[PDB]
Amino acid sequence: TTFMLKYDENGTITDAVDCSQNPLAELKCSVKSFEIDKGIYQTSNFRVVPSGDVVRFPNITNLCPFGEVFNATKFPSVYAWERKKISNCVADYSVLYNSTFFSTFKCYGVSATKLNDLCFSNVYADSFVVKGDDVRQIAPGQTGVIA
Amino acid sequence: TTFMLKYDENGTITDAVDCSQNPLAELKCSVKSFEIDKGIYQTSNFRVV
Amino acid sequence: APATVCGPKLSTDLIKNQCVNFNFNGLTGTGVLTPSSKRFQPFQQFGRDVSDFTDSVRDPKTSEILDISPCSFGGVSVITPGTNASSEVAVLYQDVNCTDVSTAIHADQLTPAWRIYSTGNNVFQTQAGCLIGAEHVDTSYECDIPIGAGICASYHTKSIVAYTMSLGADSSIAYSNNTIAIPTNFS
Amino acid sequence: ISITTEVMPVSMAKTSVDCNMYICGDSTECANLLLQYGSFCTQLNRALSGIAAEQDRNTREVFAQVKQMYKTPTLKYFGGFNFSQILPDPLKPTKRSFIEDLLFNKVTDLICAQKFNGLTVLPPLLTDDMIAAYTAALVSGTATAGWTFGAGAALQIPFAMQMAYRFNGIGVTQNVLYENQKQIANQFNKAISQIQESLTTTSTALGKLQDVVNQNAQALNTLVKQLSSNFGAISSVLNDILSRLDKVEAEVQIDRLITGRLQSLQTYVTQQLIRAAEIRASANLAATKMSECVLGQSKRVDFCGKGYHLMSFPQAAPHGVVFL
Amino acid sequence: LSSNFGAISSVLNDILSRLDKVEAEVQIDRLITGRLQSLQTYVTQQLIRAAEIRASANLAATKMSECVLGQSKRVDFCGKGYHLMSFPQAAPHGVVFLHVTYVPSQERNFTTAPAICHEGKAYFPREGVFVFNGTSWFITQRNFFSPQIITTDNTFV
Amino acid sequence: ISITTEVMPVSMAKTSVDCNMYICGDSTECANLLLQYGSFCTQLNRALS
């Protein structure tokens, strides 16, 4: 709890005010005084939240679309990359993330820990295989290489 | 192009404004209205190279 | 769009009740979640304010139209007589509404969270806020501590009195065809 | 004898922006980062709480000018002079003048729904009923008593004898009233009926006040559009940044967004202090005009009226005073 | 000064004694630009407040010129009632005036008219009211019952 | 009869400023970078206009 202490001139804590004890005691922590003049002041705090609704879309509730991508065999070339549309599949990136299969996981735009929670409208696995010098170079910007 | 849109109280777009149509329409996109009273207004920059 | 790639979270059901941590497809926050009458073409599933807020969403399971009013924030203004004159208990605003806060001080729904608070019993409602603590008396003396929209607080019966404002005093002077009034003594 | 609408703005909206709710709508993951800026809340919320308490002090400087208050006289016809400006009781359900009825239209239990932005408007501490109650007695006492009315208690004077001192206050002799007392009375009642026609249409009592009505409510409309801004963050919405950015990478993206939104209040709360310092200077002017054009006759010229000044009348207005 | 403007700690010599001059520069330049913004906040608060005091000093200077050095005829600028004089008293960072006012008190319900009773065309007073007490007409100054005999020098046609 | 000057300032220099020319006039990548701030093109220019 926020808690006002009155140190003395000599250095002894002689008195104190608990902040959330009274609204009168709330005022004393605001104006930093014990002798409040007659009037009207502020503390401006309000309104905590009881409940939570986490309602989201699917009634169909399919699962794990990208198991047929990463564990799938054929990946085409750089320029001939395939775009795969995913529809109505509840993805679990937490299964994807904690299993360390990947060298570069430059999770741009979002972050993997909070990627499990939110929803989307389409994901597109764009898959292609490059020479290792261009792995860092597939990023926003990085336009210098030919890949 | 910068492009103003009026949404109705219902919700269907009733009218739109191209910003670079005429210098009347630079103003409407600047002050965010259709009905302009009178006077003198702003939207500045000049001179491509 | 119609939200396609979701997460493993289970979907609860909506309530009209205030201050719900709503999570309509990654759109977190809180607020009153009352249904309303808005058009919502099927290619628009997320409505906004006059300037850029999560205002109205479609419930993606039940396809229902509902808008969000946020949780009832505002200032809190305590009203005191002088502590050397009276350390008697303060009376307070809550800058929203009577019934929204009086039904939210029956349990821990506010977060100033005063420990010992023997209130409300004298809960008024004014134009400015709600003004919990003070006793509304229909007499009218003179504005001591200004409240808002023509009412003022003071320290009378000793309690704290949320009287509406009196304007000076009433004076009865008669306009007449003939009568002038000149003074004799002067201070 | 011409009467003149002069319009002084005396107050503005008692705005009290909620610094926490403006910068970060409810998310205590943010409010730790705003807590380590120390005192840019609570010095924000004091610097325009000091405005809002002062915005009633302006209205108490102007109207709370006579001590005791005066009931509306019934026989409004005062020795030739019509007085349709003095709050008719049986006709009007509302308690305000008929000219004042023409004023509140020509601008712009009501509770605000408290939008996501964090803004609110405190109500003015003097209601429009009470402000019209003042301009009842300010018009009534000036018509009935007039002189020690301003100096102290009321000393009643028949209105022709009161005006004859005001002609004597010009310099023109007391004879010149009663020589033309009917012709003076008709020019007075003609001049008011122009005001019930001129400011019906031409938007003048709009004009000076609608500057205060717009510009104070227009800087709110700039302040709410700063929430839509990006400020070098990823998403303009504060809830999106907490929802998808690790809360250690968010503390870059939130902190780039707080310093924008906190600076947009210091842009706003500075300009509200300066507009308050203009309106206070306009209220201190109006507190002298109701002192010196209403409670008495002023001889310092082109200050009250635009000629040799006989008398004046307050009329209530939304956040303003219309003098006649 | 005891803020934390995106830094480790605002005790500024602690930042120099922990982070060594190449990573400290991140922890100080963010700490400066929040601290330097607090001065620009403060000086803006002082410029506006000086404008409010200069407006109150220019108002007090006109009271010093008019309520003190002369007698202001315009009402309720110096005093409350009719104004006689004022005594300026010094005050810490201010001026307290002592506005000596008149404020006439004891009123009398009298009766008057300008249409006086005389065979010739009626008269009008020079600073008078044509007051009438019991069975006698007089003229007085408007703010004091000083009953003068209605004569030629008081009136005109 | 002593006549006395009394000097009274009534106006100052009506100074405007192009906000976008002040911040970065030549660069349009910076003008893209300045665009993601608030209405400081407008409100800063409207304030001293």
PDB file of all heavy atoms in Angstrom, chain C residues 175-178, chain D residues 75-83 143 157-161 163 177-178 180-186 188-189:
ATOM      1  N   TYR C 175     -41.453  49.157  -7.554  1.00  0.00           N
ATOM      2  CA  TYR C 175     -41.498  50.213  -8.550  1.00  0.00           C
ATOM      3  C   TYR C 175     -42.815  50.960  -8.424  1.00  0.00           C
ATOM      4  O   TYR C 175     -43.871  50.352  -8.230  1.00  0.00           O
ATOM      5  CB  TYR C 175     -41.344  49.643  -9.954  1.00  0.00           C
ATOM      6  CG  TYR C 175     -41.427  50.705 -11.021  1.00  0.00           C
ATOM      7  CD1 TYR C 175     -40.381  51.591 -11.225  1.00  0.00           C
ATOM      8  CD2 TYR C 175     -42.555  50.823 -11.820  1.00  0.00           C
ATOM      9  CE1 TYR C 175     -40.455  52.567 -12.196  1.00  0.00           C
ATOM     10  CE2 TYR C 175     -42.640  51.798 -12.789  1.00  0.00           C
ATOM     11  CZ  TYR C 175     -41.585  52.662 -12.976  1.00  0.00           C
ATOM     12  OH  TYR C 175     -41.668  53.630 -13.949  1.00  0.00           O
ATOM     13  N   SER C 176     -42.753  52.280  -8.516  1.00  0.00           N
ATOM     14  CA  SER C 176     -43.940  53.096  -8.343  1.00  0.00           C
ATOM     15  C   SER C 176     -43.906  54.276  -9.294  1.00  0.00           C
ATOM     16  O   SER C 176     -42.865  54.617  -9.862  1.00  0.00           O
ATOM     17  CB  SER C 176     -44.072  53.592  -6.905  1.00  0.00           C
ATOM     18  OG  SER C 176     -44.235  52.506  -6.010  1.00  0.00           O
ATOM     19  N   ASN C 177     -45.070  54.894  -9.460  1.00  0.00           N
ATOM     20  CA  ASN C 177     -45.204  56.046 -10.336  1.00  0.00           C
ATOM     21  C   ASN C 177     -44.529  57.268  -9.730  1.00  0.00           C
ATOM     22  O   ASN C 177     -44.047  58.145 -10.454  1.00  0.00           O
ATOM     23  CB  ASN C 177     -46.695  56.312 -10.583  1.00  0.00           C
ATOM     24  CG  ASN C 177     -46.954  57.257 -11.745  1.00  0.00           C
ATOM     25  OD1 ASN C 177     -46.034  57.686 -12.439  1.00  0.00           O
ATOM     26  ND2 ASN C 177     -48.224  57.583 -11.962  1.00  0.00           N
ATOM     27  N   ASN C 178     -44.454  57.330  -8.401  1.00  0.00           N
ATOM     28  CA  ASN C 178     -44.170  58.586  -7.725  1.00  0.00           C
ATOM     29  C   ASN C 178     -43.089  58.496  -6.658  1.00  0.00           C
ATOM     30  O   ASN C 178     -42.451  59.511  -6.363  1.00  0.00           O
ATOM     31  CB  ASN C 178     -45.456  59.118  -7.089  1.00  0.00           C
ATOM     32  CG  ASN C 178     -46.504  59.468  -8.119  1.00  0.00           C
ATOM     33  OD1 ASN C 178     -46.192  60.033  -9.167  1.00  0.00           O
ATOM     34  ND2 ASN C 178     -47.753  59.117  -7.839  1.00  0.00           N
TER      35      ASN C 178
ATOM     36  N   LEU D  75     -45.624  44.586 -13.565  1.00  0.00           N
ATOM     37  CA  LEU D  75     -46.027  45.557 -14.581  1.00  0.00           C
ATOM     38  C   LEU D  75     -44.774  46.034 -15.302  1.00  0.00           C
ATOM     39  O   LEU D  75     -44.198  47.073 -14.981  1.00  0.00           O
ATOM     40  CB  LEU D  75     -46.777  46.722 -13.951  1.00  0.00           C
ATOM     41  CG  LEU D  75     -48.125  46.429 -13.296  1.00  0.00           C
ATOM     42  CD1 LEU D  75     -48.641  47.669 -12.595  1.00  0.00           C
ATOM     43  CD2 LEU D  75     -49.126  45.948 -14.331  1.00  0.00           C
ATOM     44  N   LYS D  76     -44.371  45.257 -16.315  1.00  0.00           N
ATOM     45  CA  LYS D  76     -43.098  45.465 -17.002  1.00  0.00           C
ATOM     46  C   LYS D  76     -43.048  46.787 -17.755  1.00  0.00           C
ATOM     47  O   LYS D  76     -41.960  47.311 -18.016  1.00  0.00           O
ATOM     48  CB  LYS D  76     -42.850  44.316 -17.972  1.00  0.00           C
ATOM     49  CG  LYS D  76     -42.678  42.975 -17.308  1.00  0.00           C
ATOM     50  CD  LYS D  76     -42.525  41.889 -18.350  1.00  0.00           C
ATOM     51  CE  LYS D  76     -42.201  40.559 -17.703  1.00  0.00           C
ATOM     52  NZ  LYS D  76     -43.304  40.030 -16.854  1.00  0.00           N
ATOM     53  N   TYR D  77     -44.202  47.323 -18.129  1.00  0.00           N
ATOM     54  CA  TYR D  77     -44.269  48.637 -18.746  1.00  0.00           C
ATOM     55  C   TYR D  77     -43.895  49.708 -17.727  1.00  0.00           C
ATOM     56  O   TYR D  77     -44.646  49.971 -16.784  1.00  0.00           O
ATOM     57  CB  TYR D  77     -45.678  48.862 -19.280  1.00  0.00           C
ATOM     58  CG  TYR D  77     -45.922  50.163 -19.995  1.00  0.00           C
ATOM     59  CD1 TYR D  77     -45.545  50.337 -21.322  1.00  0.00           C
ATOM     60  CD2 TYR D  77     -46.562  51.210 -19.348  1.00  0.00           C
ATOM     61  CE1 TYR D  77     -45.792  51.526 -21.977  1.00  0.00           C
ATOM     62  CE2 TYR D  77     -46.809  52.399 -19.989  1.00  0.00           C
ATOM     63  CZ  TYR D  77     -46.428  52.551 -21.302  1.00  0.00           C
ATOM     64  OH  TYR D  77     -46.680  53.747 -21.930  1.00  0.00           O
ATOM     65  N   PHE D  78     -42.737  50.332 -17.921  1.00  0.00           N
ATOM     66  CA  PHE D  78     -42.168  51.272 -16.954  1.00  0.00           C
ATOM     67  C   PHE D  78     -42.217  52.681 -17.528  1.00  0.00           C
ATOM     68  O   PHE D  78     -41.225  53.144 -18.094  1.00  0.00           O
ATOM     69  CB  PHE D  78     -40.730  50.899 -16.614  1.00  0.00           C
ATOM     70  CG  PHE D  78     -40.596  49.719 -15.706  1.00  0.00           C
ATOM     71  CD1 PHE D  78     -39.425  48.990 -15.689  1.00  0.00           C
ATOM     72  CD2 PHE D  78     -41.631  49.324 -14.888  1.00  0.00           C
ATOM     73  CE1 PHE D  78     -39.282  47.904 -14.859  1.00  0.00           C
ATOM     74  CE2 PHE D  78     -41.483  48.250 -14.041  1.00  0.00           C
ATOM     75  CZ  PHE D  78     -40.312  47.534 -14.037  1.00  0.00           C
ATOM     76  N   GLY D  79     -43.349  53.361 -17.347  1.00  0.00           N
ATOM     77  CA  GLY D  79     -43.519  54.746 -17.747  1.00  0.00           C
ATOM     78  C   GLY D  79     -43.262  55.038 -19.211  1.00  0.00           C
ATOM     79  O   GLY D  79     -42.677  56.069 -19.546  1.00  0.00           O
ATOM     80  N   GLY D  80     -43.676  54.130 -20.088  1.00  0.00           N
ATOM     81  CA  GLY D  80     -43.441  54.299 -21.508  1.00  0.00           C
ATOM     82  C   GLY D  80     -42.580  53.206 -22.104  1.00  0.00           C
ATOM     83  O   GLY D  80     -42.652  52.927 -23.304  1.00  0.00           O
ATOM     84  N   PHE D  81     -41.773  52.569 -21.270  1.00  0.00           N
ATOM     85  CA  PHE D  81     -40.744  51.652 -21.727  1.00  0.00           C
ATOM     86  C   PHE D  81     -41.230  50.218 -21.563  1.00  0.00           C
ATOM     87  O   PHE D  81     -41.754  49.853 -20.510  1.00  0.00           O
ATOM     88  CB  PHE D  81     -39.467  51.898 -20.928  1.00  0.00           C
ATOM     89  CG  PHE D  81     -38.899  53.290 -21.101  1.00  0.00           C
ATOM     90  CD1 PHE D  81     -39.258  54.313 -20.244  1.00  0.00           C
ATOM     91  CD2 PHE D  81     -38.034  53.581 -22.136  1.00  0.00           C
ATOM     92  CE1 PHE D  81     -38.744  55.584 -20.396  1.00  0.00           C
ATOM     93  CE2 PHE D  81     -37.513  54.851 -22.297  1.00  0.00           C
ATOM     94  CZ  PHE D  81     -37.873  55.854 -21.426  1.00  0.00           C
ATOM     95  N   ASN D  82     -41.060  49.404 -22.610  1.00  0.00           N
ATOM     96  CA  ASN D  82     -41.811  48.154 -22.692  1.00  0.00           C
ATOM     97  C   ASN D  82     -41.214  47.057 -21.821  1.00  0.00           C
ATOM     98  O   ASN D  82     -41.960  46.403 -21.084  1.00  0.00           O
ATOM     99  CB  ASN D  82     -41.904  47.651 -24.136  1.00  0.00           C
ATOM    100  CG  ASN D  82     -43.012  46.614 -24.329  1.00  0.00           C
ATOM    101  OD1 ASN D  82     -43.786  46.336 -23.414  1.00  0.00           O
ATOM    102  ND2 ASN D  82     -43.081  46.038 -25.523  1.00  0.00           N
ATOM    103  N   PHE D  83     -39.896  46.839 -21.918  1.00  0.00           N
ATOM    104  CA  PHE D  83     -39.161  45.811 -21.175  1.00  0.00           C
ATOM    105  C   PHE D  83     -39.674  44.391 -21.397  1.00  0.00           C
ATOM    106  O   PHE D  83     -40.243  43.780 -20.488  1.00  0.00           O
ATOM    107  CB  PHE D  83     -39.135  46.114 -19.673  1.00  0.00           C
ATOM    108  CG  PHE D  83     -38.222  47.236 -19.297  1.00  0.00           C
ATOM    109  CD1 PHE D  83     -38.709  48.513 -19.112  1.00  0.00           C
ATOM    110  CD2 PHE D  83     -36.871  47.009 -19.125  1.00  0.00           C
ATOM    111  CE1 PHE D  83     -37.860  49.544 -18.759  1.00  0.00           C
ATOM    112  CE2 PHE D  83     -36.025  48.035 -18.772  1.00  0.00           C
ATOM    113  CZ  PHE D  83     -36.519  49.302 -18.589  1.00  0.00           C
ATOM    114  N   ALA D 143     -33.603  48.830 -13.487  1.00  0.00           N
ATOM    115  CA  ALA D 143     -34.832  49.497 -13.896  1.00  0.00           C
ATOM    116  C   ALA D 143     -35.533  50.126 -12.702  1.00  0.00           C
ATOM    117  O   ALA D 143     -36.049  51.244 -12.787  1.00  0.00           O
ATOM    118  CB  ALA D 143     -35.747  48.508 -14.609  1.00  0.00           C
ATOM    119  N   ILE D 157     -36.423  54.212  -7.405  1.00  0.00           N
ATOM    120  CA  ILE D 157     -36.626  55.467  -8.130  1.00  0.00           C
ATOM    121  C   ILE D 157     -37.554  55.205  -9.302  1.00  0.00           C
ATOM    122  O   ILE D 157     -37.426  54.189  -9.998  1.00  0.00           O
ATOM    123  CB  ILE D 157     -35.279  56.059  -8.641  1.00  0.00           C
ATOM    124  CG1 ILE D 157     -34.385  56.501  -7.478  1.00  0.00           C
ATOM    125  CG2 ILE D 157     -35.461  57.242  -9.569  1.00  0.00           C
ATOM    126  CD1 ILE D 157     -32.999  56.955  -7.880  1.00  0.00           C
ATOM    127  N   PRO D 158     -38.560  56.063  -9.493  1.00  0.00           N
ATOM    128  CA  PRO D 158     -39.390  55.958 -10.698  1.00  0.00           C
ATOM    129  C   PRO D 158     -38.553  56.161 -11.946  1.00  0.00           C
ATOM    130  O   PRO D 158     -37.687  57.034 -11.996  1.00  0.00           O
ATOM    131  CB  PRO D 158     -40.420  57.078 -10.521  1.00  0.00           C
ATOM    132  CG  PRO D 158     -39.794  58.022  -9.574  1.00  0.00           C
ATOM    133  CD  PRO D 158     -38.982  57.187  -8.643  1.00  0.00           C
ATOM    134  N   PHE D 159     -38.825  55.324 -12.950  1.00  0.00           N
ATOM    135  CA  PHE D 159     -37.852  55.056 -14.005  1.00  0.00           C
ATOM    136  C   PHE D 159     -37.599  56.271 -14.884  1.00  0.00           C
ATOM    137  O   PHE D 159     -36.517  56.413 -15.463  1.00  0.00           O
ATOM    138  CB  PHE D 159     -38.326  53.879 -14.847  1.00  0.00           C
ATOM    139  CG  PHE D 159     -37.358  53.471 -15.901  1.00  0.00           C
ATOM    140  CD1 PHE D 159     -36.226  52.762 -15.570  1.00  0.00           C
ATOM    141  CD2 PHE D 159     -37.570  53.804 -17.221  1.00  0.00           C
ATOM    142  CE1 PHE D 159     -35.328  52.383 -16.536  1.00  0.00           C
ATOM    143  CE2 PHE D 159     -36.671  53.429 -18.190  1.00  0.00           C
ATOM    144  CZ  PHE D 159     -35.552  52.719 -17.848  1.00  0.00           C
ATOM    145  N   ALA D 160     -38.577  57.164 -14.988  1.00  0.00           N
ATOM    146  CA  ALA D 160     -38.351  58.416 -15.696  1.00  0.00           C
ATOM    147  C   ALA D 160     -37.396  59.309 -14.922  1.00  0.00           C
ATOM    148  O   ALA D 160     -36.533  59.968 -15.509  1.00  0.00           O
ATOM    149  CB  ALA D 160     -39.680  59.125 -15.936  1.00  0.00           C
ATOM    150  N   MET D 161     -37.532  59.337 -13.595  1.00  0.00           N
ATOM    151  CA  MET D 161     -36.620  60.120 -12.770  1.00  0.00           C
ATOM    152  C   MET D 161     -35.233  59.500 -12.757  1.00  0.00           C
ATOM    153  O   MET D 161     -34.229  60.203 -12.610  1.00  0.00           O
ATOM    154  CB  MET D 161     -37.165  60.237 -11.349  1.00  0.00           C
ATOM    155  CG  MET D 161     -38.441  61.034 -11.243  1.00  0.00           C
ATOM    156  SD  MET D 161     -38.194  62.746 -11.715  1.00  0.00           S
ATOM    157  CE  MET D 161     -37.186  63.306 -10.347  1.00  0.00           C
ATOM    158  N   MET D 163     -33.904  57.798 -15.403  1.00  0.00           N
ATOM    159  CA  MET D 163     -33.321  58.100 -16.703  1.00  0.00           C
ATOM    160  C   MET D 163     -32.946  59.566 -16.810  1.00  0.00           C
ATOM    161  O   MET D 163     -31.971  59.918 -17.480  1.00  0.00           O
ATOM    162  CB  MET D 163     -34.292  57.717 -17.812  1.00  0.00           C
ATOM    163  CG  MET D 163     -34.442  56.252 -18.019  1.00  0.00           C
ATOM    164  SD  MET D 163     -32.864  55.624 -18.566  1.00  0.00           S
ATOM    165  CE  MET D 163     -32.761  56.431 -20.157  1.00  0.00           C
ATOM    166  N   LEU D 177     -35.507  65.031 -21.233  1.00  0.00           N
ATOM    167  CA  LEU D 177     -36.307  63.818 -21.126  1.00  0.00           C
ATOM    168  C   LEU D 177     -37.791  64.140 -21.212  1.00  0.00           C
ATOM    169  O   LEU D 177     -38.475  63.718 -22.146  1.00  0.00           O
ATOM    170  CB  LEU D 177     -35.998  63.076 -19.827  1.00  0.00           C
ATOM    171  CG  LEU D 177     -36.642  61.693 -19.658  1.00  0.00           C
ATOM    172  CD1 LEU D 177     -35.687  60.861 -18.920  1.00  0.00           C
ATOM    173  CD2 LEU D 177     -37.927  61.681 -18.854  1.00  0.00           C
ATOM    174  N   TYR D 178     -38.298  64.914 -20.251  1.00  0.00           N
ATOM    175  CA  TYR D 178     -39.739  65.076 -20.082  1.00  0.00           C
ATOM    176  C   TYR D 178     -40.345  65.914 -21.197  1.00  0.00           C
ATOM    177  O   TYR D 178     -41.558  65.896 -21.425  1.00  0.00           O
ATOM    178  CB  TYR D 178     -40.019  65.698 -18.721  1.00  0.00           C
ATOM    179  CG  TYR D 178     -39.584  64.814 -17.589  1.00  0.00           C
ATOM    180  CD1 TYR D 178     -38.379  65.033 -16.937  1.00  0.00           C
ATOM    181  CD2 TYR D 178     -40.373  63.753 -17.176  1.00  0.00           C
ATOM    182  CE1 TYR D 178     -37.976  64.225 -15.905  1.00  0.00           C
ATOM    183  CE2 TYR D 178     -39.977  62.934 -16.148  1.00  0.00           C
ATOM    184  CZ  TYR D 178     -38.778  63.178 -15.514  1.00  0.00           C
ATOM    185  OH  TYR D 178     -38.380  62.365 -14.481  1.00  0.00           O
ATOM    186  N   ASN D 180     -39.575  65.173 -24.198  1.00  0.00           N
ATOM    187  CA  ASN D 180     -39.770  64.167 -25.235  1.00  0.00           C
ATOM    188  C   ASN D 180     -39.937  62.763 -24.668  1.00  0.00           C
ATOM    189  O   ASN D 180     -39.459  61.800 -25.273  1.00  0.00           O
ATOM    190  CB  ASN D 180     -38.597  64.198 -26.209  1.00  0.00           C
ATOM    191  CG  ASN D 180     -38.445  65.535 -26.883  1.00  0.00           C
ATOM    192  OD1 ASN D 180     -37.462  66.238 -26.669  1.00  0.00           O
ATOM    193  ND2 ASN D 180     -39.425  65.901 -27.694  1.00  0.00           N
ATOM    194  N   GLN D 181     -40.614  62.635 -23.521  1.00  0.00           N
ATOM    195  CA  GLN D 181     -40.652  61.377 -22.780  1.00  0.00           C
ATOM    196  C   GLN D 181     -41.376  60.278 -23.541  1.00  0.00           C
ATOM    197  O   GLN D 181     -41.021  59.100 -23.420  1.00  0.00           O
ATOM    198  CB  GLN D 181     -41.306  61.614 -21.417  1.00  0.00           C
ATOM    199  CG  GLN D 181     -41.335  60.415 -20.485  1.00  0.00           C
ATOM    200  CD  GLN D 181     -41.962  60.740 -19.144  1.00  0.00           C
ATOM    201  OE1 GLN D 181     -42.370  61.874 -18.896  1.00  0.00           O
ATOM    202  NE2 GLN D 181     -42.060  59.741 -18.279  1.00  0.00           N
ATOM    203  N   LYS D 182     -42.360  60.635 -24.360  1.00  0.00           N
ATOM    204  CA  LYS D 182     -43.015  59.621 -25.173  1.00  0.00           C
ATOM    205  C   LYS D 182     -42.146  59.232 -26.360  1.00  0.00           C
ATOM    206  O   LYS D 182     -42.051  58.051 -26.709  1.00  0.00           O
ATOM    207  CB  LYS D 182     -44.379  60.116 -25.644  1.00  0.00           C
ATOM    208  CG  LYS D 182     -45.173  59.056 -26.386  1.00  0.00           C
ATOM    209  CD  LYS D 182     -46.523  59.573 -26.840  1.00  0.00           C
ATOM    210  CE  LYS D 182     -47.326  58.461 -27.486  1.00  0.00           C
ATOM    211  NZ  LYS D 182     -46.673  57.978 -28.733  1.00  0.00           N
ATOM    212  N   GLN D 183     -41.493  60.214 -26.986  1.00  0.00           N
ATOM    213  CA  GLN D 183     -40.665  59.933 -28.156  1.00  0.00           C
ATOM    214  C   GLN D 183     -39.424  59.139 -27.770  1.00  0.00           C
ATOM    215  O   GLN D 183     -38.958  58.284 -28.529  1.00  0.00           O
ATOM    216  CB  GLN D 183     -40.278  61.241 -28.846  1.00  0.00           C
ATOM    217  CG  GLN D 183     -39.496  61.063 -30.141  1.00  0.00           C
ATOM    218  CD  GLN D 183     -39.132  62.384 -30.789  1.00  0.00           C
ATOM    219  OE1 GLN D 183     -39.414  63.452 -30.248  1.00  0.00           O
ATOM    220  NE2 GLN D 183     -38.501  62.318 -31.957  1.00  0.00           N
ATOM    221  N   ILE D 184     -38.883  59.408 -26.581  1.00  0.00           N
ATOM    222  CA  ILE D 184     -37.769  58.618 -26.058  1.00  0.00           C
ATOM    223  C   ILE D 184     -38.216  57.190 -25.778  1.00  0.00           C
ATOM    224  O   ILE D 184     -37.492  56.223 -26.050  1.00  0.00           O
ATOM    225  CB  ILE D 184     -37.193  59.303 -24.804  1.00  0.00           C
ATOM    226  CG1 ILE D 184     -36.434  60.568 -25.200  1.00  0.00           C
ATOM    227  CG2 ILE D 184     -36.346  58.365 -23.959  1.00  0.00           C
ATOM    228  CD1 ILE D 184     -36.037  61.417 -24.023  1.00  0.00           C
ATOM    229  N   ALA D 185     -39.443  57.034 -25.286  1.00  0.00           N
ATOM    230  CA  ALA D 185     -39.939  55.714 -24.921  1.00  0.00           C
ATOM    231  C   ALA D 185     -40.171  54.848 -26.150  1.00  0.00           C
ATOM    232  O   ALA D 185     -39.972  53.630 -26.111  1.00  0.00           O
ATOM    233  CB  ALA D 185     -41.224  55.849 -24.109  1.00  0.00           C
ATOM    234  N   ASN D 186     -40.581  55.457 -27.262  1.00  0.00           N
ATOM    235  CA  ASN D 186     -40.840  54.661 -28.452  1.00  0.00           C
ATOM    236  C   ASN D 186     -39.549  54.271 -29.153  1.00  0.00           C
ATOM    237  O   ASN D 186     -39.474  53.202 -29.766  1.00  0.00           O
ATOM    238  CB  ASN D 186     -41.765  55.405 -29.408  1.00  0.00           C
ATOM    239  CG  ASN D 186     -43.157  55.573 -28.848  1.00  0.00           C
ATOM    240  OD1 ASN D 186     -43.644  56.689 -28.676  1.00  0.00           O
ATOM    241  ND2 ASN D 186     -43.800  54.456 -28.536  1.00  0.00           N
ATOM    242  N   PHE D 188     -36.761  53.618 -27.623  1.00  0.00           N
ATOM    243  CA  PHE D 188     -36.240  52.528 -26.812  1.00  0.00           C
ATOM    244  C   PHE D 188     -36.903  51.211 -27.186  1.00  0.00           C
ATOM    245  O   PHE D 188     -36.232  50.188 -27.360  1.00  0.00           O
ATOM    246  CB  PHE D 188     -36.471  52.847 -25.339  1.00  0.00           C
ATOM    247  CG  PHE D 188     -35.936  51.820 -24.400  1.00  0.00           C
ATOM    248  CD1 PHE D 188     -34.594  51.777 -24.105  1.00  0.00           C
ATOM    249  CD2 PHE D 188     -36.777  50.903 -23.802  1.00  0.00           C
ATOM    250  CE1 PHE D 188     -34.099  50.839 -23.230  1.00  0.00           C
ATOM    251  CE2 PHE D 188     -36.289  49.973 -22.921  1.00  0.00           C
ATOM    252  CZ  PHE D 188     -34.951  49.934 -22.641  1.00  0.00           C
ATOM    253  N   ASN D 189     -38.224  51.228 -27.339  1.00  0.00           N
ATOM    254  CA  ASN D 189     -38.951  49.996 -27.597  1.00  0.00           C
ATOM    255  C   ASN D 189     -38.817  49.585 -29.054  1.00  0.00           C
ATOM    256  O   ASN D 189     -38.993  48.415 -29.402  1.00  0.00           O
ATOM    257  CB  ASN D 189     -40.410  50.182 -27.209  1.00  0.00           C
ATOM    258  CG  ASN D 189     -40.561  50.536 -25.758  1.00  0.00           C
ATOM    259  OD1 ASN D 189     -39.836  50.023 -24.910  1.00  0.00           O
ATOM    260  ND2 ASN D 189     -41.487  51.434 -25.458  1.00  0.00           N
TER     261      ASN D 189
END
